[PDB]
Amino acid sequence: LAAFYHDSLDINNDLHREITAYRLLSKMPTLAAMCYKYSTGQPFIYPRNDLSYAENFLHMMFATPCEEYEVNPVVARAMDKIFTLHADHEQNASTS
Amino acid sequence: DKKATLHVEGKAPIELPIMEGSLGTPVIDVRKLGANGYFTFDPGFLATASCESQITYIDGGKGILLHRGYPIDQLANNADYLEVCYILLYGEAPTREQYEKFKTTVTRHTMVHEQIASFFHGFRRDAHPMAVMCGVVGALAAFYHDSLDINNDLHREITAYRLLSKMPTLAAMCYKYSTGQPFIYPRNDLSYAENFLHMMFATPCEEYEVNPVVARAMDKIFTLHADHEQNASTSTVRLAGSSGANPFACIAAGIASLWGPAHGGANEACLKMLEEIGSVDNIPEYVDRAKDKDDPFRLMGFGHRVYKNYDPRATVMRETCHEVLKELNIQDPLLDVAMELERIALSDEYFVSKKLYPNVDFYSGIILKAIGIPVSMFTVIFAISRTIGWIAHWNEMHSDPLNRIGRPRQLYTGEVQRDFQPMHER
Amino acid sequence: DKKATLHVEGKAPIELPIMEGSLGTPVIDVRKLGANGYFTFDPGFLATASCESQITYIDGGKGILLHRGYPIDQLANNADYLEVCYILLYGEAPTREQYEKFKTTVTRHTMVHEQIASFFHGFRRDAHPMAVMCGVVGALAAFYHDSLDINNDLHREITAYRLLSKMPTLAAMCYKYSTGQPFIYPRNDLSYAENFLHMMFATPCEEYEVNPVVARAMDKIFTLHADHEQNASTSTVRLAGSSGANPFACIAAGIASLWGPAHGGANEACLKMLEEIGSVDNIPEYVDRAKDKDDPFRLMGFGHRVYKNYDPRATVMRETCHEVLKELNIQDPLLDVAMELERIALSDEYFVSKKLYPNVDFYSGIILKAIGIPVSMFTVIFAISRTIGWIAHWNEMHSDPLNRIGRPRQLYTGEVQRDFQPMHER
């Protein structure tokens, strides 16, 4: 990603910084599910706009081209909660 | 407890155990012949039983074909192919629950790993499909070799599911590859034969709907070619497996064998004979060129080397063929030719008398061509069907107490010992 | 013109022709046994001669190995491998001119098409080399299938040159592929064995100079494994070829066969036994664990199933092994172990009495490991050597008047005929 946007990207322009945050926020789950698909040798699954963010992650993770995958909403709820409870933690190794 | 005795001239009688099976020809046990200073001579092994087996029984003269004791006609009129596969693997008809579980599992393995899907781009698109099929089955060997302990009978069970589930996926991939169309993923709401045809013919441009008469036909085809006792390719699979070789590499060897025109070309040779006649007009003349013993032209697809009177697979294939043609209502000169040859075989005395009935190859060629399967794919389909028999033989071989590495003999006809002299000295 | 007679109990005597070769065991012709209502039973075909052949003669007890009548020791002490290959193909020692022409041709085919070089990227880099080797030989089949008429004996000659020239290129490619180093092109100023080692070990980072003692050793290794009469892999190549299969697919089947641990693992099993002993200290204790009949530990690489007294290949390999070790002057605990086992085998009565001499596998394992060839490549090297024997058998089979498709029999031990009832009715 760094390679790809480096030229368009002026870190002093606070508006480029806003776009950059949307980019990481939107793509991170797509890339995550891609790693999963890659490592197990299954095909990538495109995002579906009719899905919520957590729903959409699980779908990209577990769906196959072989049938309709239906995300169980208890699980989608759980995944949402997980994202939330790990969103931020003040200063710490990785944030620092 | 009988015995045969073999006498030479001034040597003592040799005693050889006679063994009998549940059915068919008794055998003379020659395992110890070598110690008495002879081997047998048997080109093609036409008289040599390499093994005991419980899978498939054939008695040609009487028109018998059995899988685990079940007659093929009853199997084909009353079971789907996967059920027949169950039988070949486990030795008994499954319960409904065992069958449901068997279908679910088959379905789960139907997708092919992306790494194996990539391997197609190793071939040119015009490579012959059986070739591609060999390579691709060899890739499976690469892929599972490390996880795979052939002594663990549970790895062997998984391996059979893998070939059973993937073989049609790979087959349809070869087809798509060679015509430059995109691969089609399996669909779980489809039956095994349905799913094959869909992966073969669907496109991303519309919904493809598999006609159920055709899906029925394809199922019947799989079934009627599932297994055939010992024969070039099955023996190849056993012989290669007797060294402890990876099962997928053994299957690949079987496919290599099947691809030989003398094992896997009968379907085509039969279409080729129809094109050679060209028109209904030319029937009687070509009829007579078959009859001319000195005329290279013979009728391909009539009578049988083994099912001399009646092949019970032919009766089913005949009925399936007529359904397909009525349903697709094709108009083609070669069909008419084919259909007229059939009327003649079934009336004309010389055909009824010389036992020259339209055989299983005749009808399966017609069905395959009528459903839009190209000639280059005929043997690959044979391969898809037979794979389940290969693997069951392989398994049975592996579980045999009498299993050991093959080392056939020869009769030496070459040079006697002579001294070699270095090139500088000549 | 003798005959054997086989008697049953109340049936008439059966008359079976006895055939004799130029050398070795006479054979009882059973081609017509079937018509009298029997087959033989012969697991492994240990007593069944599938064919006539002039290529290689073995008499184990007497320590004889002949290629077109030339004894292997004379061949190995006096010819290079390509000369031996010439002999296997054409049946006679070449003149100097025929040999020069033969070398030039071999050299011309040594490069592999870029399209075949690409096919490696189909595999993961850690795939087992024999696997890669199968696929890659299957790719050759794809590539030449259309140009290739197996009935044209001139296509068959070209095909043998192709396998002979490329097999070492592909072998070294598997090696480079699996270790992630770049491929090394053939060099025409090098000899065949020289050129193999160079393609195996050179890098773009400096001039690689092949040590000539090692190149000599590698040549000897090729030679001593060029051919071995009928056996799992060679029989596999014939059996698969009997259907008219593409020669490259037949070779691929042979490689599949060879890869089975019971055909191609002897070298390794022998290194594995050395690592298991670990130190000179542990010799006598492990010696005694071999002796314990109830102790799974046996000595791998001593004595022989076939060359019961003396393998004449072992004498040469012994001398080659000592040259290599003196030249490379390696210091390794496993070498010391190996060398001490050797001193013992050659003195200790129980070894000399039980005929447990250090065999051709013992020494070739040591040479291979000492020259930096990894274990994963041991069978691939066996495959490179043997390919020339495979192809000569294949050719001879194809030129046989008695050639026909194999269809071995079975003894049926399965279920008797039973009715099948549909699942809904159970």
The two beta strands, C39-41 and B48-53, are parallel
**Interface contact B40-C49, CB threshold 8 A:** yes
Q: Is B378 strand, coil or helix?
A: helix
Instruction: For residue C86, give the CATH number of its domain.
Output: 1.10.580.10
Assigned domain for C423 exists: no
Residues of B annotated as catalytic (active site), given as ranges: 304, 361
**Interface contact B110-A66, CB threshold 8 A:** yes
From the number of C-beta atoms within 10 Å of its C-beta (0-12, 13-18, 19+), residue C31 rates as middle
* C74-C76-C80-C84 Cα dihedral, nearest 10 degrees: 70
Question: Tokens 């002594």 belong to which residue?
Answer: B151
**Interface contact B423-C48, CB threshold 8 A:** no
Q: Is B409 strand, coil or helix?
A: strand
Do B208 and B126 lie in a common domain?
Answer: yes
Assigned domain for C288 exists: yes
Query: In chain B, which residue's Cα lies nearest the Cα of C10?
Result: B4
Do B258 and B387 lie in a common domain?
Answer: yes
Q: Angle at CA C325, nearest 5°, toward C321 and C328?
A: 135
Residue among A41, A64, A65 whose CB faces B115 most closely: A41
Do C131 and C221 lie in a common domain?
Answer: yes
* C399-C400-C404-C408 Cα dihedral, nearest 10 degrees: -120
Is A41 at the interface with chain B, CB within 8 A?
A: yes
Do C172 and C89 lie in a common domain?
Answer: yes
Assigned domain for B417 exists: no
Do C2 and C64 lie in a common domain?
Answer: no
- Active-site residue, from C361, C393, C398, C424: C361
Is A70 at the interface with chain B, CB within 8 A?
A: no
The two beta strands, B39-41 and C48-53, are parallel
Number of domains in chain C: 3
Nearest residue to B386 (alpha-carbon basis) of B241, B270, B242, B232: B232
Distance CA C148, CA C130 (A): 25
Assigned domain for C192 exists: yes
Question: Tokens 């051919």 belong to which residue?
Answer: C227
Nearest residue to C419 (alpha-carbon basis) of B66, B53, B219: B66
Long-range contacts of C326-331 (CB under 8 A, 24+ apart): C327/C211, C327/C213, C327/C214, C328/C211, C328/C214, C328/C370, C328/C371, C330/C370
Query: Could you tell me if residue B297 is left (phi over 0), alpha (psi between -120 and 50 degrees) or otherwise beta?
Result: beta
Do C161 and C110 lie in a common domain?
Answer: yes
Distance CA B319, CA B224 (A): 13
Do C133 and C207 lie in a common domain?
Answer: yes
Q: Of C48, C69, C85, which one is at a domain's C-terminal end?
A: C48
Assigned domain for C239 exists: yes
Residue by residue, what is the 3-state secondary structure of B193-235?
HHHHHHHHHCCCCCCCCCCHHHHHHHHHHHHHCCCCCCCHHHH
Do B85 and B219 lie in a common domain?
Answer: yes
Do C5 and C60 lie in a common domain?
Answer: no
Instruction: For residue B306, give the CATH number of its domain.
Output: 1.10.230.10
Assigned domain for C19 exists: yes
CA B106 to mean position of chain CA atoms = 21
**Interface contact B45-C44, CB threshold 8 A:** no
Do C205 and C284 lie in a common domain?
Answer: no
Instruction: For residue C4, give the CATH number of its domain.
Output: 2.20.28.60
| Chains linked to A by 3 or more Cβ pairs within 8 Å | B
Assigned domain for B425 exists: no
- Do the beta carbons of residue C369 and residue C271 sit within 8 Å? yes
Do C230 and C278 lie in a common domain?
Answer: no
Query: How much of chain A is in helix, strand and coil states, percent to nearest 5?
Result: 60, 0, 40
Describe the strand order of the beta sheet including C14-19 as a list of residue ranges.
B409-412, C48-53, B39-41, C27-29, C14-19, C3-7, B3-7, B14-19, B27-29, C39-41, B48-53, C409-412
Query: Domain range for residue B308?
Result: 264-374
**Interface contact B31-C42, CB threshold 8 A:** yes
Tokens of C366: 């040591």
Resolution of the model in angstroms? 2.5
Do B156 and B189 lie in a common domain?
Answer: yes
Q: Is B136 strand, coil or helix?
A: helix
Which method, experimentally, gave rise to this model? Answer: X-ray
CB atoms within 10 A of CB C42: 28
Question: Tokens 């023996």 belong to which residue?
Answer: B235
- Do the beta carbons of residue B116 and residue C122 sit within 8 Å? no
DSSP string, C45-68: GTTEEEEEESSEEEETTTTEEEET
Distance CA C235, CA B240 (A): 9
Assigned domain for C405 exists: yes
For CA atoms B138, B143, B144, B147, give the dihedral sign: positive
Please name the residues between 351 and 390 in chain B that touch chain C, using a CB distance below 8 Å: none
